[PDB]
User: What shape does this take?
Amino acid sequence: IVGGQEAPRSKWPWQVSLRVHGPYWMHFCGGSLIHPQWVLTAAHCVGPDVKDLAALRVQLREQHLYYQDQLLPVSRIIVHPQFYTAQIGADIALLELEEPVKVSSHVHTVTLPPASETFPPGMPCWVTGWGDVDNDERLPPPFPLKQVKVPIMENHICDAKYHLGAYTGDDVRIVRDDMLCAGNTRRDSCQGDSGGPLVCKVNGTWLQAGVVSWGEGCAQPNRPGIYTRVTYYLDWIHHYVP
Amino acid sequence: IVGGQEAPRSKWPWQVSLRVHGPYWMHFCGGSLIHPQWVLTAAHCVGPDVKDLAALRVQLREQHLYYQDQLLPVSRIIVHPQFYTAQIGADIALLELEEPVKVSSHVHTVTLPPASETFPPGMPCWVTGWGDVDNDERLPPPFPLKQVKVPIMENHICDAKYHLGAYTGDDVRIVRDDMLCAGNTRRDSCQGDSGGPLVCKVNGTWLQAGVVSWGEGCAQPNRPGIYTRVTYYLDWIHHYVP
Amino acid sequence: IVGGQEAPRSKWPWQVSLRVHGPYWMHFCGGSLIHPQWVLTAAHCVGPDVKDLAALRVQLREQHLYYQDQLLPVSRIIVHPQFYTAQIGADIALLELEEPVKVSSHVHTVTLPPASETFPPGMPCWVTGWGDVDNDERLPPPFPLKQVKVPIMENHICDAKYHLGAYTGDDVRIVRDDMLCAGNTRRDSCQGDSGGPLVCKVNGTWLQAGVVSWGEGCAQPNRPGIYTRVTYYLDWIHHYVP
Amino acid sequence: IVGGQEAPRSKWPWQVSLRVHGPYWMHFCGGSLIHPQWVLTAAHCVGPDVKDLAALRVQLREQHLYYQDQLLPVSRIIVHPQFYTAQIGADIALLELEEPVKVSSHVHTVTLPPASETFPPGMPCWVTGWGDVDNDERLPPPFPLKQVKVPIMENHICDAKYHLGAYTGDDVRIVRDDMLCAGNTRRDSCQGDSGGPLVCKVNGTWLQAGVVSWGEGCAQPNRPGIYTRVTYYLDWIHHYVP
Ligand SMILES: NCc1ccc2c(c1)C1(CCN(C(=O)/C=C/c3ccccc3)CC1)CO2
Ligand SMILES: NCc1ccc2c(c1)C1(CCN(C(=O)/C=C/c3ccccc3)CC1)CO2
Ligand SMILES: NCc1ccc2c(c1)C1(CCN(C(=O)/C=C/c3ccccc3)CC1)CO2
Ligand SMILES: NCc1ccc2c(c1)C1(CCN(C(=O)/C=C/c3ccccc3)CC1)CO2
Assistant: This one.
């Protein structure tokens, strides 16, 4: 997370960390609990290449990475069949936990938005995660969960911004309709935040508008952060999550 | 270049080296001389972000990189407007030399293929370059130009192979019509070969079938090297090159 | 620490962590509390180049590095004036805390040996710290404090060990009089443990026999770890420490 | 070499490059031909750990490393028995080539100094090699041999410099009598130059005053380069070299 601050311990009860087996169970991507037995994340964290379930674990909401891990096994990984790269799109995936979660006050699911919610500029949104605090700059121990308020922008503007300082024809789409843009040169998501959630407080309810996906660097001019647009994939999510 | 051997001094008089300004004029990509004043390379080598012509130079065929540099300024960098990533396609670009080359003894142009050439499996094809000799293994000094003979694989077969061991739907095209596949687990191009030529001897003449574009690693099982198919962009090339 | 295991919470109340300013107050060396206002460490941790005191902090015993830091400022650095390198000798230094420490129960001082003490061969002593777990292998987060039991090796025997497979003349002393050997190919201190204590239980009491100083690698054949011999420097220590 | 320039092709005919077996025969240290069959280098290049002769080769003067290699096998490695670290001293060694050289015009031994030659300040002196061009900044391809004129500094004056900004006692000698100092913040040797020749022109003749040994960084304030003083080791050299 670029800019922003360490999260209070009562906020973002839906945030998860994905761990890969190695010299230790290392954080590699974020995710969000959207159902007591299901985690929403980005496909580029787990695909397009199929990997071994046994080597993956999920850690639930934790103020400091690694401090008091309670790692959870995954029974299923479900990656959107349309996914190949983040720029092409469909950067979304689901993890079915071996067992449902004992939902607490410290840990619970985030609400998915109605298909109608567009998240227009002006909505108050936050992105959270344990990723780099800037380009090539790791989150320092003891790895607190971070949050940053980010401005949302309409897709046509974000797409046009990406063509500034680039060879790509203005008529050639860069930011697709299944994506959503947010951030500026001081507030952004970054490497390690991938898969994590962008949430917006709508009518008193925090809704997950997006999934940290990609961008050119972090907090770079005319290169806002790009998220997978959750509303686009409600149909797909509902094939699997009750 | 993975596999193969150091090139004879007489072979591949069209191979060029692209250099970027820094501590030294460092090789970052290959290219081919297709006109005394024009160099053909890959788009991802010089984009999609717009670069300054001053930090760029071109070096014509050398047996050993850096050892007899006569660097050449470039007056125009022309990048295919459809390009954004190598997976999406249109990974091709043109460099106009500030001044025409005088066709030397070890410096000639490569012939572009007629639109009729599909380059079926079984044809004799070489890729050349000064890139990595394997995944994350640099070409050792004194940096001899390498060549390797690579088996051509039909697009549809190559596309289906890229799906092997991936989540990506059989529905979804990975290797596109503007691309071409060649290489196996012992013969391939790699990082630093990008922008370089793939050449096939057809009826007594060497034609440039492809431009080194991308792939999943180098020389990996079921992941042959991917090239920009030159016949697909003849029109665009001819729009600029006499 | 090479080999051994995580230290129980009750043990080694004198162990401290030396921190350098930067992106975060990063641990670079160990040490020991020998008095409520004084920490014993290695000269090479804080020399021979004179350091900025404002860039230094001390952290009393912690089960896990970084989680719950309570960093203490330092008012004086005192480096033995004979120190230039660890191979030459005199690898010992003192840090004066700006304020006396409130001695606790899980933070006590360690007892220094009487002027005569020898610590005979074979005798089992303990070295502790947050250092690397092997050659080029960092202690994984959450960075638990490690301990390991290491056998003392008599100096002359150790010195000969250091001559095996070396050009250095037998009559040239490599392990010196102000040094002490301990460890084997399975149990040793390592980078990051430097400045930390080697302790022995003598007649029911833990005495600090040495300070982690140096060695040829960690736990390599014929190269036990070298510690600075505390008894050699008792007089110097007592000139500053009440 | 820090500062200075590429050497003319006719100069320093005695310069040699030491190579170790790897992906390629990589340069790791310098040295000088002091006899058709003998190379003088630093001990820290080859010791104090005993090394396999079949893993080492010598390259006689080349304008550019690796470019036109003719590697020469070594029959004996002779490391001064007193060597253990460069700061301690006796950083000198001798390599016996498997066979004598065919002393041409491009290759020619350098002359050793008479015992009484002291090399006082003001004397004209150059150091040459293929080492780093600055701290942590490698010599760029195509790796030309560099040269630089270095100011000689009296041991006692040099010693004083080394005490500035250091905790080391004034009475503790850092720069020993078997060492010689030269260079400043613009001109100095550096990593990879070690073992190579420091030559001074005395009464029209070039004499090798020093062997590149060590220093605190390269070209740092108050830290001249330190060399083994050749005069000091004449007797030991002559016990082996006719
Ligand atoms: N702040 C949004 C964001 C969040 C998480 C995250 C990133 C960006 C990455 C930053 C670094 N990366 C790039 O720079 C990609 C360059 C690129 C060049 C050309 C065409 C497309 C893309 C890959 C994405 C790594 O993880
Ligand atoms: N042998 C063909 C080839 C030639 C030159 C060259 C390469 C491959 C690169 C190898 C390393 N790279 C990857 O591994 C890309 C992985 C990838 C994963 C998922 C979807 C798309 C792509 C990027 C391409 C670097 O330059
Ligand atoms: N277990 C003992 C020990 C404890 C802590 C610690 C070390 C060793 C270091 C290990 C790596 N280093 C070396 O290998 C030194 C090689 C050397 C070569 C030639 C002459 C003398 C020495 C430097 C010391 C780093 O910190
Ligand atoms: N220009 C002189 C010179 C020539 C060749 C060469 C060097 C210096 C090295 C530079 C880096 N090094 C150090 O910084 C040593 C630090 C040190 C700290 C404390 C006490 C003694 C020493 C090791 C020597 C590498 O090879």
User: Anything to note?
Assistant: Chain B has two domains: 1-12+110-231, 13-109+232-242. The two ends of chain B are 31 Å apart (CA to CA).
